[PDB]
Design a protein around this nucleic acid. Structure first.
Ligand SMILES: [Fe+3]
Ligand SMILES: [Zn+2]
Lengths: 144, 249, 450, 249
DNA sequence: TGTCGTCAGGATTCCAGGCAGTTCG
DNA sequence: CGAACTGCCTGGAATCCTGACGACA
């Protein structure tokens, strides 16, 4: 699932850090997994192929007709958004632990994509949410 | 660090800490010469829970020095599942990281647990003008929120001079409840001006279902300012939830 | 690395200067017209757990159907419009229906149109076996709105007669003007690329600044006041790993800053109208007003650069232009034969024949579910546009100006894989005093051949 | 049509609705001057359910014009889940084609819902040979359906002039439920011919989910003919199922 | 062909309010 | 002669392991 793989990856990074005496850099397979994941997520969201629950063989067209004409119930859709929502904290923690370039654009792009796809509607007077992403964004804004 | 607190029957405290665990997991109980205190923030920085219990709640209370200890909410929820309403809860702690929970009765029970530490940052909430105060019963609010929970999540409270209204809007459902001084669910009103605010009711429903029916509640809010729901435990301790409303219509 | 912060050249002082009245107006702006008060309220009433994509999709479909029905009712030719429920009302009468679809079949009698929509089941002996043969053959089969007129079935609403969704051709003459304002069709710039034509682009910019060569060019640029452009200045991230070697500039925000600084040195009396593109630093779906707060700070620093949306409909002195990119043209060229990548006029007329940018689904362009539909064209536009086609072809279809922009950089690796030659270094500058052109200046010899 | 109906027994109304809930999501209620005639037909076409509630039942009855309504099971059950007996049930309607339910007494709850207009069909009540009538008790009916919902699936009712037996078999077990003057649940009956019939168990088990324990329900059937299971409430309201006989194996 | 997320679904135990048995002015 | 004060116990509901689905490499 997620717990064992995430714990194994974190422990591998930690033992590599102990071995190299706390001196490492960023990796590339994380991006080689995220960018195809983002593209596949976008393609699945633009396809939206549904399937009737009891009508297991008749695949309903993306045009919504209310319900299945042969089964007056809900139609199971292909969201495919729970995987990226769980993969985002991995890249967030990685970019917080180690600083690298050429990927803050991808990070802000995927975060804004999630935000404007949902479009954080409640906020108190005392915010100040710590985020290395927002920190680097403000830094680049000031540098611009 | 060492202390001993004995009380014959603590089911209220048990369900209270159960609600606190359902709210958040990381929590630290600070033990001072006056009693116990706790303040739990929110991972999404939207809700704040506060509780204080002086030394006039339990039967036996002997503390050595004021400090801050930590208890895992999961490990505590795995403990309160055996709390009989006619038991004698004894919380004992020494200098080592050993916490003892004892129960005396038909069979002497004693559970030892490790004591981890919590490093949650504590900050005093700044003062804010309420401009709207009311004291109501818990059962009426609980049943109203349980009736308006299935239709929608944004429940709107409106308060005017000697007038209260709890409504639930939507596109295919509408609920309304009126409250006056001669009603059966209002204890007292301290309204100042016409206020109206809509709040989410997930944590609301959970925290009002965790609290019993005969208990009373005190709501403090304003036009669009965050709401604070407080109540008293055995006329000595205090407990208050605090959370901001939504900006949508 | 390069920075593009040194190209600072004063315009031609000897060139005839002229500053006249410049009434600048627009029609479409999603930031004030689309997300004003309708977007936040879609359902806003759910249980403790549920979904919103299906509700937003249904609301978008209903709004699009309502807008199309309103447009067809505004069309003063079609009458006796009923719904599928009114099938229980009308018994023996030829009925007209502007409907959605389920599938198309090419039969001998007429065309066999299976039709689904939000109300019922419509069989059609649709009249594509009439003057609208090529039209209904080039329309999209799984996602389209076609107009049928004919018989009542035996339970399934089963029409039998001809109709395509035509646009009003008969139009009145717009009020004439006394000067010349220009649309210079330039899109898919892709600055900071390894194959970008930097020298040709800076030479074209210096020539547009006033440094002209021919007397006709000087006379044409002496009265230019508006410069309408498409946009698409960058590519972004998230294309292919080899894009790392394709990035001639390591940064992208620096690319934006350099582009803004290069476009800032232009004079102030020339008002440029720029918009985003397909490779936008925003939601990959359509449509989008512009960039974020950080990605548009130099754009706000620039005053005369009117940052229009993409797609966006602009109205100026009684002339209607629209700036769009379009991606369903690939679906069209894959569906109907007799079409090629070098047929942008045909692709754009196929897009325009439905009063919508791209009603097709299951394609390579994303569309997020939003109840507000803006791709419906209210009035007949006087300037069409496309994007990422990298081909140029001027077209006057029924008095409507449908012209392509092309590209301005060399052939990319994707084009080499597809083995299609592009049309770079094209300056099509059109006057629209009467919804027309001006000329097409070309300087391809200024760069090497690819 | 603006109307107003005020009575007591919201618990009884919720019980009746839950008894007539799991059949169809929308039932046709003719609300006329003489009262409420609710009809519904099972989607599988196995049982036709109908209730008749006269006007003299309600304490306050103000009706301008007779009408018809399609009551939705989802919203009706989500609203009637809080039916009480110490309060007063009110159903009102104004000029808008909506539905308003008022609840006074221990509180003041107003529920406004949009009246959906879905198509409905009219069905008749055919005269049926009635030769075996028995009054059964809720406890006996519950225990019979419970012992018939574990192993057995095919039930056979045999009513003789002095007794009533039920032979149940699903795959291997032979159940025999025999009732006669030996029990207080069967003291009055009317049987002139020995009637035999065959039926199932799932539809009965789904339809008896809203019946009471101390209630007395009348049941009339004959030789392999449809069954009429009726019961009266408040001496005026009547509610009746129309079960179809199963002749297959 | 290996992996990862979602969904429903029915069987299970835990909680709460109604039915019943019982000691108080 | 009626009223709280429990047992208890069964209905209602929250929890969860199992059975479907789709996504990438
Ligand atoms: Fe391009
Ligand atoms: Zn492009």
């Amino acid at each position: 699932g997620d717990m064992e793989e995430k714990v194994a990856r974190q422990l591998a990074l930690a033992e590599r850090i102990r071995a190299v005496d706390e001196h490492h850099v960023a990796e590339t397979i994380i991006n080689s997994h995220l960018v195809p994941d983002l593209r596949g997520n976008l393609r699945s969201f633009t396809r939206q192929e549904f399937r009737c629950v009891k009508c297991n063989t008749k695949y309903r067209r993306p045009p919504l007709t209310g319900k299945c004409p042969k089964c007056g119930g809900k139609i199971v859709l292909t969201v495919s958004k729970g995987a990226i929502e769980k993969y985002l904290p991995t890249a967030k923690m990685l970019v917080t632990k180690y600083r690298v370039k050429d990927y803050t654009r991808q990070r802000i792009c995927i975060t804004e994509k999630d935000i404007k796809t949902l479009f954080e509607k409640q906020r108190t007077l005392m915010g100040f949410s710590a985020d290395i992403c927002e920190k680097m964004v403000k830094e680049r804004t000031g540098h611009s | 660090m060492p202390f001993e607190v004995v009380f014959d029957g603590a089911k209220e405290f048990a369900d209270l800490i159960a609600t606190a665990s359902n709210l958040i997991d990381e929590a630290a109980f600070k033990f001072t010469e006056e009693g116990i205190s706790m303040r739990a923030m929110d991972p999404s920085r939207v809700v704040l829970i506060d509780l204080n219990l002086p030394e006039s709640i339990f039967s036996k209370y002997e503390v050595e020095e004021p400090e801050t200890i930590g208890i895992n909410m999961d490990q505590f929820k795995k403990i309160l599942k055996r709390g009989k309403a006619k038991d004698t809860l004894i919380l004992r702690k020494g200098d080592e990281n050993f916490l003892e929970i004892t129960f005396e009765g038909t069979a002497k029970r004693t559970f030892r647990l490790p004591l981890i530490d919590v490093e949650e940052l504590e900050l005093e909430l700044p003062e804010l003008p309420f401009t709207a105060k009311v004291v109501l019963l818990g059962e009426v609010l609980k049943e109203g929120i349980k009736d308006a929970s299935l239709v929608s999540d944004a429940i709107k409270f409106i308060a005017k001079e000697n007038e209260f209204t709890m409504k639930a809007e939507g596109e295919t459902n509408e609920v309304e409840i009126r409250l006056t001084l001669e009603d059966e669910g209002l204890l007292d009103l301290e309204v100042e001006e016409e206020t109206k605010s809509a709040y989410g009711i997930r944590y609301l429903s959970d925290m009002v279902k965790g609290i019993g029916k005969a208990d009373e509640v005190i709501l403090r809010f304003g036009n669009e300012m965050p709401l604070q729901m407080e109540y008293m435990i055995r006329d000595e301790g205090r407990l208050t939830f605090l959370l901001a409303p939504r900006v949508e219509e | 690395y390069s920075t593009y912060s040194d190209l600072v050249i004063a315009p031609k002082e000897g060139f005839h200067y002229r500053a006249k009245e410049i009434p600048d107006e627009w029609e479409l702006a999603f930031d004030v017209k689309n997300v004003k008060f309708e977007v936040p309220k879609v359902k806003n009433a759910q249980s403790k757990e549920g979904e919103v994509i299906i509700q937003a999709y249904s609301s978008y479909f209903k709004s699009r159907l309502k807008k199309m029905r309103r447009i067809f009712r505004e069309n003063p030719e079609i009458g006796t419009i009923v719904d599928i429920a009114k099938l229980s009302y009308v018994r023996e009468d030829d009925v007209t229906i502007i409907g959605l679809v389920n599938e198309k079949r090419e039969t001998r009698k007429g065309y066999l149109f299976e039709i689904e929509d939000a109300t019922g089941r419509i069989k059609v002996f649709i009249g594509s076996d009439k003057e609208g043969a090529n039209e209904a053959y080039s329309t999209i089969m799984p996602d389209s709105v076609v107009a049928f007129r004919g018989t009542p079935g035996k339970g399934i609403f089963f029409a039998n007669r001809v109709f395509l969704p035509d646009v009003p051709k008969f139009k009145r003459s717009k009020p004439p003007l006394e000067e010349k304002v220009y649309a210079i069709l330039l899109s898919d710039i892709h600055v900071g690329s390894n194959k970008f034509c930097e020298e040709a682009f800076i030479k074209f910019l210096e020539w547009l600044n006033g440094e002209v060569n021919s007397r006709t060019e000087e006379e044409l640029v002496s009265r230019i006041k508006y410069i309408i452009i498409g946009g698409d200045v960058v590519d972004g991230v998230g294309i292919y790993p080899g894009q790392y070697n394709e990035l001639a500039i390591p940064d992208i925000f620096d690319q934006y800053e350099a582009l803004a600084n290069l476009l800032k040195q232009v004079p102030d009396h020339i008002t440029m109208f720029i918009g985003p593109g397909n490779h936008d630093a925003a939601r990959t779906a359509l449509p989008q007003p512009g960039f974020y707060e950080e990605y548009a700070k130099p754009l706000y620093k620039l005053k005369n650069a009117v940052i229009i949306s993409n797609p966006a409909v602009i109205r100026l002195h009684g002339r209607d232009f629209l700036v769009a990119h379009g991606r369903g043209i690939e679906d069209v060229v894959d569906f109907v034969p007799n079409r090629s990548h070098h047929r942008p006029a045909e692709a754009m007329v196929e897009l325009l024949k439905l009063r919508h940018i791209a009603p097709t689904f299951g394609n390579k362009v994303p569309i997020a579910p939003d109840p507000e539909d803006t791709l419906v064209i209210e009035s007949v536009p006087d300037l069409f546009q496309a994007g990422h086609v990298h081909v140029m072809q001027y077209k006057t279809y029924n008095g409507v100006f449908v012209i392509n922009t092309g590209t301005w950089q060399a052939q990319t690796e994707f084009q080499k894989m597809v083995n299609i030659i592009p049309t770079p270094a094209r300056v099509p500058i059109i006057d629209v005093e009467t919804a027309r052109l001006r000329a097409v200046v070309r300087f391809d010899q200024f760069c090497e051949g690819v």
